[PDB]
Design an enzyme around this catalytic site. Structure first.
Site, short mmCIF file in Angstrom:
data_model
loop_
_atom_site.label_atom_id
_atom_site.label_comp_id
_atom_site.label_asym_id
_atom_site.label_seq_id
_atom_site.Cartn_x
_atom_site.Cartn_y
_atom_site.Cartn_z
N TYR A 1 0.88 -1.43 0.41
CA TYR A 1 0.04 -0.18 -0.04
C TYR A 1 1.08 1.49 0.61
N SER B 1 -10.15 11.40 27.10
CA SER B 1 -10.42 13.01 26.45
C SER B 1 -10.63 12.69 24.55
N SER C 1 -8.66 -7.01 -0.42
CA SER C 1 -8.67 -5.68 -1.04
C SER C 1 -7.71 -4.78 -1.30
N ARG D 1 2.45 10.95 -9.70
CA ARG D 1 1.75 11.04 -10.90
C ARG D 1 0.50 12.38 -10.86
N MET E 1 -1.31 21.61 -14.77
CA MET E 1 -2.37 22.50 -14.16
C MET E 1 -1.80 23.78 -13.65
N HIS F 1 -8.73 25.87 1.64
CA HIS F 1 -9.09 25.27 2.29
C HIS F 1 -9.11 23.33 2.69
N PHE F 2 -9.02 23.32 1.92
CA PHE F 2 -8.94 21.43 1.87
C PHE F 2 -7.92 20.94 1.74
N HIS F 3 -7.15 21.29 0.30
CA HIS F 3 -5.81 21.37 0.54
C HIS F 3 -4.88 21.38 1.82
N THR G 1 -11.91 -4.35 3.65
CA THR G 1 -11.20 -4.17 4.16
C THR G 1 -11.75 -3.16 5.41
N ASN H 1 -7.27 -9.42 2.92
CA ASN H 1 -7.15 -8.47 2.77
C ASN H 1 -5.70 -8.42 1.89
N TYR I 1 -13.25 12.56 7.09
CA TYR I 1 -12.57 11.38 8.29
C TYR I 1 -12.29 10.83 8.06
N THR J 1 -12.25 18.35 18.04
CA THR J 1 -10.16 18.38 17.12
C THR J 1 -10.04 19.18 17.65
N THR K 1 -10.82 -7.69 13.21
CA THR K 1 -9.76 -7.77 13.72
C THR K 1 -9.41 -6.76 15.30
N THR L 1 -11.85 -1.29 -0.15
CA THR L 1 -12.14 -0.63 1.13
C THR L 1 -13.43 -0.81 2.25
N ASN M 1 -2.58 -1.86 8.20
CA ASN M 1 -1.73 -2.74 8.00
C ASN M 1 -1.14 -3.14 8.84
N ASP N 1 0.31 16.18 -11.95
CA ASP N 1 -0.89 17.01 -13.42
C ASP N 1 -0.98 18.25 -11.88
N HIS O 1 -18.26 13.36 3.41
CA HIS O 1 -18.08 13.92 3.94
C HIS O 1 -17.76 13.17 5.08
N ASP P 1 -1.90 -11.38 13.27
CA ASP P 1 -2.49 -11.86 11.56
C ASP P 1 -3.70 -10.91 12.16
N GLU Q 1 -15.63 10.93 4.50
CA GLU Q 1 -14.77 9.74 3.50
C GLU Q 1 -13.56 10.68 3.82
N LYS R 1 -8.65 17.49 20.85
CA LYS R 1 -7.55 16.58 20.15
C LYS R 1 -5.99 17.75 20.69
N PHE S 1 -6.82 17.81 -14.16
CA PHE S 1 -7.83 17.83 -12.98
C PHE S 1 -8.41 16.61 -12.14
N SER T 1 -0.81 11.31 18.04
CA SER T 1 -1.10 11.44 19.13
C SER T 1 -0.38 10.66 19.50
N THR U 1 -7.45 -2.60 -4.49
CA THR U 1 -6.93 -1.13 -5.05
C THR U 1 -6.19 -1.44 -6.34
C1 HEO Z 1 -8.27 15.94 5.36
C2 HEO Z 1 -9.48 16.87 4.45
C3 HEO Z 1 -10.72 16.59 4.99
C4 HEO Z 1 -11.45 17.30 6.73
C5 HEO Z 1 -11.25 16.15 7.41
C6 HEO Z 1 -11.79 18.33 6.34
C7 HEO Z 1 -12.95 18.50 7.50
C8 HEO Z 1 -13.36 19.79 7.65
N1 HEO Z 1 -13.61 20.80 6.12
FE1 HEO Z 1 -12.41 21.05 4.89
N2 HEO Z 1 -12.76 19.03 5.31
C9 HEO Z 1 -11.16 18.24 4.45
C10 HEO Z 1 -10.92 18.55 3.20
C11 HEO Z 1 -12.45 19.13 2.23
N3 HEO Z 1 -13.30 19.60 3.03
C12 HEO Z 1 -14.09 19.62 1.95
C13 HEO Z 1 -15.05 20.68 2.27
C14 HEO Z 1 -15.44 21.27 3.33
C15 HEO Z 1 -17.07 22.12 2.97
C16 HEO Z 1 -17.73 22.62 1.87
C17 HEO Z 1 -17.05 23.16 0.96
C18 HEO Z 1 -18.34 24.55 0.59
O1 HEO Z 1 -18.96 25.13 1.00
O2 HEO Z 1 -17.83 24.83 -0.90
C19 HEO Z 1 -16.51 23.18 4.66
C20 HEO Z 1 -17.79 23.92 5.17
C21 HEO Z 1 -15.25 22.29 4.70
C22 HEO Z 1 -15.03 23.08 5.96
C23 HEO Z 1 -14.31 22.37 6.86
C24 HEO Z 1 -15.16 21.87 8.59
C25 HEO Z 1 -15.29 22.76 9.41
C26 HEO Z 1 -14.20 20.25 8.86
C27 HEO Z 1 -14.43 19.66 10.22
O3 HEO Z 1 -14.94 18.52 9.98
C28 HEO Z 1 -12.74 19.94 11.09
C29 HEO Z 1 -12.49 20.89 11.02
C30 HEO Z 1 -10.92 20.86 11.99
C31 HEO Z 1 -11.18 21.71 12.57
C32 HEO Z 1 -12.07 23.40 13.28
C33 HEO Z 1 -9.81 22.42 14.13
C34 HEO Z 1 -8.86 23.86 14.14
C35 HEO Z 1 -9.30 23.71 15.72
C36 HEO Z 1 -8.67 23.79 16.36
C37 HEO Z 1 -7.37 24.35 17.70
C38 HEO Z 1 -10.03 24.74 17.76
C39 HEO Z 1 -10.19 26.10 17.44
C40 HEO Z 1 -11.76 25.85 17.55
C41 HEO Z 1 -12.60 26.39 17.07
C42 HEO Z 1 -12.59 26.35 15.57
C43 HEO Z 1 -13.93 26.65 17.66
N4 HEO Z 1 -14.33 20.97 4.29
C44 HEO Z 1 -13.61 18.58 0.42
C45 HEO Z 1 -14.44 18.91 -0.27
C46 HEO Z 1 -14.07 19.52 -1.80
C47 HEO Z 1 -14.88 19.37 -3.02
O4 HEO Z 1 -16.19 20.28 -2.61
O5 HEO Z 1 -14.79 18.98 -3.99
C48 HEO Z 1 -12.32 18.30 1.44
C49 HEO Z 1 -11.61 17.71 0.29
C1 HEM Z 2 0.54 18.18 -3.33
C2 HEM Z 2 0.55 19.11 -3.10
C3 HEM Z 2 -0.89 20.00 -3.94
C4 HEM Z 2 -0.89 20.54 -5.59
C5 HEM Z 2 -0.21 21.60 -5.76
C6 HEM Z 2 -2.36 21.02 -5.59
C7 HEM Z 2 -2.77 21.26 -6.84
C8 HEM Z 2 -4.41 21.45 -7.18
C9 HEM Z 2 -4.62 21.90 -8.11
C10 HEM Z 2 -4.18 23.31 -8.56
C11 HEM Z 2 -6.07 22.16 -7.96
C12 HEM Z 2 -7.16 22.73 -9.06
C13 HEM Z 2 -7.56 24.38 -8.25
C14 HEM Z 2 -8.25 24.88 -9.14
O1 HEM Z 2 -9.69 24.15 -10.08
O2 HEM Z 2 -7.83 25.86 -9.46
C15 HEM Z 2 -6.43 20.44 -7.57
C16 HEM Z 2 -7.78 20.30 -7.07
C17 HEM Z 2 -7.58 19.15 -6.57
N1 HEM Z 2 -6.77 18.47 -5.73
FE1 HEM Z 2 -4.96 18.99 -5.23
N2 HEM Z 2 -3.19 19.15 -5.20
C18 HEM Z 2 -1.97 18.39 -4.49
C19 HEM Z 2 -2.20 18.00 -3.55
C20 HEM Z 2 -4.00 17.01 -3.74
C21 HEM Z 2 -3.82 15.88 -2.46
C22 HEM Z 2 -3.03 15.18 -1.91
C23 HEM Z 2 -4.96 15.64 -2.84
C24 HEM Z 2 -6.56 14.22 -1.94
C25 HEM Z 2 -5.72 14.23 -0.81
C26 HEM Z 2 -5.32 16.39 -3.58
C27 HEM Z 2 -7.10 16.89 -3.82
C28 HEM Z 2 -7.27 17.40 -4.85
C29 HEM Z 2 -8.76 17.48 -5.57
C30 HEM Z 2 -10.16 16.06 -5.34
C31 HEM Z 2 -9.10 18.09 -6.19
C32 HEM Z 2 -9.99 19.23 -6.36
C33 HEM Z 2 -10.68 17.67 -8.24
C34 HEM Z 2 -11.88 18.90 -8.58
O3 HEM Z 2 -11.88 19.90 -9.07
O4 HEM Z 2 -12.55 17.93 -9.47
N3 HEM Z 2 -4.25 17.60 -4.34
N4 HEM Z 2 -5.90 20.62 -6.39
CU LIG Z 3 -17.90 18.43 3.75
#
Ligand code: HEO
Ligand code: HEM
Ligand SMILES: [Cu+2]
Ligand SMILES: CCCCCCCCCCCCCCCCCC(=O)OC[C@H](COP(=O)(O)OCCN)OC(=O)CCCCCCCCCCCCCCCCC
Ligand SMILES: CCCCCCCCCCCCCCCCCC(=O)OC[C@H](COP(=O)(O)OCCN)OC(=O)CCCCCCCCCCCCCCCCC
Ligand SMILES: CCCCCCCCCCCCCCCCCC(=O)OC[C@H](COP(=O)(O)OCCN)OC(=O)CCCCCCCCCCCCCCCCC
Lengths: 184, 658, 260, 96
Positions: free
Chosen positions: B61, B315, B145, B71, B79, B419-421, B204, B142, B288, B359, B211, B201, B124, B75, B284, B135, B286, B362, B103, B299, B149
């Site tokens: 894995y 806690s 799985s 790869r 981009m 945010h998500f990156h 898995t 496993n 977590y 969070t 297990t 998955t 694993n 990409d 969503h 095991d 996924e 933690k 993309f 930890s 993948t």
């Molecule tokens: C690692 C991956 C991952 C995780 C775990 C999270 C968890 C969270 N996501 Fe980011 N998300 C992640 C990656 C993305 N989220 C997304 C979608 C997404 C959206 C919807 C998109 C939209 O509205 O357009 C929101 C609002 C956020 C916010 C958050 C929030 C509030 C959490 C919470 O569950 C956890 C946040 C963590 C916190 C809060 C810790 C900071 C706090 C400290 C110490 C405490 C401070 C106390 C306060 C702030 C009260 N996530 C998408 C979809 C993208 C797409 O549209 O294709 C991806 C990939």
């Molecule tokens: C290593 C550095 C990384 C860079 C520089 C990067 C860069 C980018 C960029 C430029 C985009 C396009 C955003 C746009 O539309 O303008 C994108 C999309 C995305 N990336 Fe990455 N990325 C990285 C890592 C990751 C990783 C590790 C993940 C997943 C865990 C991830 C998941 C995604 C997803 C889900 C999208 C959205 C695809 C879509 O819009 O259809 N990225 N990334």
């Molecule tokens: Cu979400």
């Protein structure tokens, strides 16, 4: 050893419960989807569904009797009960296939409306589940005939019991939500 | 040979795809040549490919995730370069027809085949060792799985070679991904890859969930497990309760695409919005699944490198359970802009905000674990500190985005990508590298080079800031996602800065590769003799640095929270058992790869509408499964002689080193 | 950015949204900043190198510390959730604006890789351009002729989705006259980059009537579904276009095309 | 379990299947009652199938036959109700 496998299959059935709940929600959203097409009231024959339900319940009871016979350490009784259960399942699948063929030939297929597509999806998913159960019964019976009642065979029979009773519960939910409620 | 497949399915004209295919095929040919020359085919088949051992499948894995990261990042570079050139009023080098493919493929690879493979590899690798088991509950499951993948990965890569990939984003929203608006075969590639990966998955998840609960070491109650085992159990619960939603959703979309049904069509009473809901109902949880295990890793690291007991164990476990419970009622926060009532938007906003508390708890528990401890600035500890610093800002931006008012203008803007990156790079890949460097001795028996590790960490963090902080400003400026051509010149400067960040991250990745190379080259000088390199608290460090295929000669007896730390404190850590007993182990099975090959054939035939080949593949899968259901010689017995020899060798190593 | 589109908005809805963003930022800072500060502080002060630092290898639980850790996030989430409820119920796009001036109805049909706008009261049609007097509420009825899109004017305020056979409501008012950029916030295909229009908030009504009269002088007319479908042909980077004569119920017919 | 419990479950299943079918085909009551009562009989039949046929007991697997099932029922009650509510709201807000 059997405990872990049975618990694993139980968790898989819980995953499958989630799988069927998603299809139920999809059907519930698209229940009124049909536009200029047949509705629930127009195509659902209640006697056919009643016969299907009774034959699947007979399948469940016969398989239960098979499990009791396996607890009684008898091979012939288990083989006979499994054959009767497989025959009931085959009858149920036959009626489902006949209903699907009748719907498709009459130009009421899954490509006609959202409602028909959702109905086909849910009943078809149940159909493939039941036919998977039937293939599992076939392989389990051919294994019993050549291996006897071993620990592995007992574990497989318990897993198939869980699977079959779960399918009967899902069919209860299906005929309650789709067939009986639609024809109301 | 039949269906849509022809000589026109391969892009002769396009140079970029052809040079990529040439690179991949020459790489494959060189690897095959090297393996043949060294004559390691038999060893690979009998020790890795057909291995039912959890450690081998974990390492494989890790290998798959690392090779797919290259790869994904290629990409990402393409981009970023296209965006930078398009911002300067230039036509650029990537037509939209290619940018959309790039993309979508990048998103799919980096979510399904980079994060999940690495995280499940770590599970694993360590989870069976930590709980004191030999095991997993279902070894063959496993292996199957792993191979499913690998089948998904193969389908995604071969999508480039023949035909095209999906041009509908990484989630394939219905109306664009429908048969009416996407006549291409790319969406079929996406469908079948994700279907088979999801099946793998789910298997898995079931395997690990059984297990953890059933095969715990005697005397180890639920509230005495290491925190990583808790996080893994929560992640597997999420997998089991979530992945069926993805399976059903993709099955409905493929029914729409193949049999011409009306699940998500814009006509004949189809409800398109349904798909989005369903996918986000899966979407969503996924994330977590990606973030819970890595928390555990941190930890563990917080316990190991602070040289003190972890703070707020109860806690932490209650916080992770709360996250698991709350991660099912928050999905609508993805589409506040869909146009749902004020009531629904406000409720989902509030419930998405609520999950922030555990969070934070933690993070504070980790901070107070570092409170009055002796901190050693190892690579793993640097990764943990960087993770805390980055993930705090990520979570801040996330809770800001969770408010519907802010979401009404920050949705699908580069603020959302920032945010998500941000949160992914902060948590997932940081925990991935931290675990890889932390658990490397338990996988190979030698340590990683610290200098190259530190260089890679610094490059990664600095590059990530430089590449993604401008995306916050760009999202504020109103520039939306997935823009390819005639980008507003006002967005040029920030994007150029982002480009700089990108190449910085590139250097980090290069550094990582170099690290591995030198770690392999100087293995004879950095061997882990004692099996306890950093004085870890958990049972996994009780074994030799190369763990035997049987994890423990005698299943350890646990009375306290940190088993190995208590064993070391009591002075009974390395005691020779009076006598060894024959150990029951499962045999290596070769049916996993056969089922994988049949599934690959079935998927490929389904994509290219080769009906007979798909029937042959499905029949092959079912027949192989039925045939493997017959044989009973699946397990063997390890004799006392071999166990005694390995234990004596390990104890001699302990005595000579000690 | 100080002079950014969202941090320096020109519409009212933009102004309340910016205020909400800043208030949320302020509330989250009070907890986030101490987290990073304590991370750096504990990393430096309590390193292995230090000898004077207090070592507690058994202090693993504290009721006071746990209560302090749990309480502050809960209070911050309570305050920001009350604010979230109030703002969400007060910033619904499907909610008419409170203003003396009567709202102007604009219909937004989202063709493939272009934007179509209809003024039914004025009875005109435009491609990739709109106009409305400043300090006047504007009522957008948005639908998609095709694949999902997202109507969005960053400076004016909130965005919305456009989906086939579904009408979605939005309200926007401009406080300052001028030209604002409008894009699509949902990827619709190869020409998605193409989708770009200009919103002209005229200083007074008279300029709006002059613009309407200029649009009325267009030789082209949109009177039948055949002309609509001819325009709806897949095209990329469509120029600004005008149409004088419009079918009284064109939006209704566009929605009813999908029988919804 | 014994033959007696299986026969009892079979008889209760026959009754709880016959009554709703006969009630629906004849329109013997108000539609509200004909819906509520059939849903109640369906859930009662589901519990009878779980207890008599599936041997749904607390003691088995040291309490993970209860916990798993109750957890998945909570997840189903979240997902189905959420989807129905969201789509009801999303359909009510797009009517002309
Ligand atoms: C690692 C991956 C991952 C995780 C775990 C999270 C968890 C969270 N996501 Fe980011 N998300 C992640 C990656 C993305 N989220 C997304 C979608 C997404 C959206 C919807 C998109 C939209 O509205 O357009 C929101 C609002 C956020 C916010 C958050 C929030 C509030 C959490 C919470 O569950 C956890 C946040 C963590 C916190 C809060 C810790 C900071 C706090 C400290 C110490 C405490 C401070 C106390 C306060 C702030 C009260 N996530 C998408 C979809 C993208 C797409 O549209 O294709 C991806 C990939
Ligand atoms: C290593 C550095 C990384 C860079 C520089 C990067 C860069 C980018 C960029 C430029 C985009 C396009 C955003 C746009 O539309 O303008 C994108 C999309 C995305 N990336 Fe990455 N990325 C990285 C890592 C990751 C990783 C590790 C993940 C997943 C865990 C991830 C998941 C995604 C997803 C889900 C999208 C959205 C695809 C879509 O819009 O259809 N990225 N990334
Ligand atoms: Cu979400
Ligand atoms: C689609 C939805 C998903 C359906 C998947 C169907 C498989 C369900 C398996 C359920 C697993 C939980 C039960 C655990 C258990 O006890 O299983 C037994 C076995 C694990 O024990 P093991 O270590 O293998 O023992 C030695 C003997 N083999 O494990 C096994 O059960 C053996 C392996 C079974 C898996 C066979 C794979 C078949 C794949 C079919 C998918 C078809 C794809 C088409 C597209 C679908 C959409
Ligand atoms: C998850 C579930 C997804 C199911 C998708 C099934 C797709 C079936 C395609 C059928 C295409 C068709 O219209 O038939 C073409 C041909 C005449 O008729 C044929 O010969 C079709 C043969 C289809 C074989 C499919 C076998 C796999 C199960
Ligand atoms: C589309 C995909 C359709 C798939 C059809 C598959 C039909 C063939 C069924 C398999 C028949 C052989 C079963 C062999 C057997 O007895 O396995 C016993 C096993 C218990 O463990 P053990 O004894 O160790 O054996 C392990 C290795 N067999 O226990 C098992 O492994 C039995 C597991 C069987 C579970 C079948 C689940 C099928 C679910 C339907 C799939 C379709 C749903 C699509 C949803 C989307 C909408």
């Amino acid at each position: 050893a059997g405990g872990t496998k049975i618990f694993g299959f139980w968790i898989y059935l819980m995953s499958d419960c989630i799988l069927f709940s998603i299809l139920f929600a999809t059907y519930a959203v698209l229940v009124n989807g049909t536009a200029g097409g047949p509705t629930g009231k127009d195509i659902f024959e209640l006697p056919f569904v009643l016969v299907e339900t009774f034959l699947l319940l007979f399948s469940s009871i016969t398989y239960g009797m098979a499990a009791i016979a396996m607890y009684k350490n008898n091979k012939s009784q288990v083989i006979s009960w499994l054959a009767l259960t497989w025959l009931f399942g085959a009858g149920f699948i036959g009626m489902e296939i006949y209903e699907f063929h009748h719907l498709i030939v009459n130009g009421m297929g899954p490509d006609r409306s959202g409602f028909l597509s959702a109905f086909f999806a849910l009943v078809g998913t149940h159909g493939l589940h039941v036919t998977s159960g039937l293939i599992w019964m076939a392989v389990l019976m051919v294994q019993i005939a050549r291996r006897g009642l071993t620990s592995t065979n007992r574990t497989r029979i318990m897993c198939l019991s869980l699977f079959w009773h779960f399918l009967d519960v899902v069919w209860i939910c299906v005929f309650t939500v789709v067939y009986l409620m639609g024809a109301m | 040979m039949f269906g849509k497949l022809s000589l026109d399915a391969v892009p002769f004209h396009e140079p970029i795809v052809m040079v990529t295919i040439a690179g991949i095929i020459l790489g494959g040919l060189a690897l095959v040549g090297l393996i043949t020359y060294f004559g390691k085919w038999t060893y690979l088949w009998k020790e890795w490919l057909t291995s039912v051992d959890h450690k081998r499948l974990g390492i494989m894995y890790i290998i798959v995730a690392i090779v797919m990261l290259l790869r994904g990042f290629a990409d990402a570079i393409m981009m970023r370069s296209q965006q930078a050139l398009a911002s300067a009023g230039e036509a650029g080098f990537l037509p939209p027809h290619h940018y959309d493919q790039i993309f979508t493929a990048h998103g799919v690879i980096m979510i399904f085949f980079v994060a999940m493979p690495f995280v499940i590899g770590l599970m694993n690798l360590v989870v069976p060792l930590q709980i004191g088991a030999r095991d997993v509950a279902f070894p063959f499951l496993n292996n199957l799985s792993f191979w499913f993948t690998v089948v998904g990965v193969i389908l995604v890569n071969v999508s480039l070679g023949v035909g095209e990939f999906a041009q509908t984003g990484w989630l394939a929203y219905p109306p664009l991904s429908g048969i009416e608006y996407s006549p291409g075969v790319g969406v079929d590639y996406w469908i079948w890859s994700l279907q088979l990966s999801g099946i793998g998955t789910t298997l898995t998840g079931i395997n690990f969930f059984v297990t953890i609960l059933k095969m715990r070491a005697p005397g180890m109650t639920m509230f005495k497990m290491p925190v990583f085992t808790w996080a893994s159990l929560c992640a597997n619960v999420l997998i089991i309760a979530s992945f069926p939603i993805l399976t059903v959703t993709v099955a409905l979309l493929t029914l729409d695409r193949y049999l011409g049904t009306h699940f998500f069509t814009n006509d004949m009473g189809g409800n398109m919005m349904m798909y989005i809901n369903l996918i986000w109902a899966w979407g969503h949880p996924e994330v977590y699944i990606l973030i819970l295990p890595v928390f555990g890793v941190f930890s563990e690291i917080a316990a190991t490198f602070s040289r003190k007991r972890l703070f707020g164990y109860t806690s932490l476990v209650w916080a992770t359970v709360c996250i698991t419970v709350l991660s099912f009622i928050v999905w609508l926060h993805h589409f506040f802009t869909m146009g749902a009532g004020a009531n629904v938007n406000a409720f989902f906003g509030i419930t998405t905000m609520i999950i922030a508390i555990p969070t934070g708890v933690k993070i504070f528990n980790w901070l107070f674990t570092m409170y009055q401890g002796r901190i050693v600035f190892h690579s793993a500890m640097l990764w943990t500190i960087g993770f805390i610093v980055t993930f705090s800002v990520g979570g801040m931006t996330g809770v800001l985005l969770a408010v519907p008012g802010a979401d009404f203008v920050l949705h699908n803007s580069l603020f959302l990508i920032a945010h998500f990156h941000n949160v992914i790079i902060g948590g997932v890949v940081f925990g991935c590298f931290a675990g890889m460097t932390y658990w490397w001795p338990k996988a190979f028996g030698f340590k990683l080079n610290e200098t190259w590790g530190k260089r890679a960490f610094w490059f990664w963090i600095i590059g990530f800031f430089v590449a993604f902080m401008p995306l916050y400003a760009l999202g504020f400026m109103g520039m939306t996602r997935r823009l390819s051509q005639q980008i507003d010149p006002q967005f040029h400067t920030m994007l150029m800065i982002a480009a700089s960040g990108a190449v910085l991250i590139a250097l980090g990745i290069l550094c990582l590769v170099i690290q591995m190379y030198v770690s392999i080259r100087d293995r004879d000088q950095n061997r882990d003799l004692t099996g306890d390199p950093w004085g870890g608290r958990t049972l996994e460090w009780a074994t030799s640095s190369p763990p035997p295929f049987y994890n423990f000669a005698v299943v350890p007896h646990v009375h306290e929270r940190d088993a190995f730390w208590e064993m070391k404190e009591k002075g009974e850590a390395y005691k020779k058992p009076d006598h060894y007993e024959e150990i029951h182990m499962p045999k290596n099975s070769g049916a996993g790869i056969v089922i994988a090959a049949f599934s690959t054939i079935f998927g490929f035939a389904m994509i290219w509408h080769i009906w007979w080949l798909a029937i042959v593949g499905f029949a092959g899968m079912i027949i192989t499964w039925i045939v493997k259901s017959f044989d009973e010689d699946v397990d063997y017995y390890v004799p006392v002689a071999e166990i005694e020899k390995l234990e004596n060798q390990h104890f001699d190593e302990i005595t000579k080193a000690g | 950015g100080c002079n950014s589109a969202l941090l320096d908005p020109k519409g009212q809805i933009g102004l309340e949204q910016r205020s909400l963003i800043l208030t949320a930022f302020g509330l989250m800072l009070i907890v986030v900043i101490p987290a990073i500060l304590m991370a750096v502080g504990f990393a430096w002060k309590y390193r292995a190198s230090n000898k004077d630092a207090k070592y507690s290898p058994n202090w693993s639980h504290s009721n006071k510390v746990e209560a302090v850790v749990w309480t502050v996030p809960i209070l911050i989430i309570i305050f920001l959730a009350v604010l979230t409820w109030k703002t969400t119920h007060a910033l619904e796009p499907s909610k008419p604006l409170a203003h003396d001036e009567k709202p102007i109805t604009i219909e937004v049909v989202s063709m493939d890789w272009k934007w179509f706008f209809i003024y039914p009261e004025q009875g005109i049609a435009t491609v990739n351009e709109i106009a409305f007097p400043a300090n006047t509420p504007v009522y957008f009825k948005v639908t998609s002729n095709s694949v999902m899109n997202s109507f969005f004017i960053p400076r004016l305020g909130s965005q919305i989705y456009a989906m086939a056979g579904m009408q979605t409501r939005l309200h926007l008012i401009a406080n300052e006259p001028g030209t604002y950029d409008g894009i699509s916030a949902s990827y619709s295909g190869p020409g998605f980059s193409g989708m770009k229009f200009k919103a002209i908030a005229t200083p007074d009504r008279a300029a709006f009537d002059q613009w309407v009269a200029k649009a009325k002088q267009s030789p082209n007319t949109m009177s039948d579904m055949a002309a609509f479908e001819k325009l709806a042909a897949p095209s990329e980077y469509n120029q600004v276009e005008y149409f004088s004569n419009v079918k009284p119920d064109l939006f209704a017919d566009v929605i009813n095309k999908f029988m919804a | 379990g014994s033959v007696k419990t299986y026969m009892t479950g079979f008889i209760l299943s026959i009754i709880l299947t016959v009554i709703p079918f006969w009630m629906v085909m004849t329109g013997a009551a108000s539609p509200a009652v004909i819906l509520g009562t059939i849903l109640a009989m369906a859930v009662v039949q589901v519990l009878v199938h779980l207890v008599c046929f599936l041997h749904m007991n607390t003691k088995s697997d040291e309490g993970w036959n209860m916990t798993a099932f109750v957890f998945t029922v909570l997840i189903i009650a979240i997902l189905v109700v959420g989807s129905i509510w969201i789509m009801w709201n999303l359909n009510y807000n797009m009517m002309m």
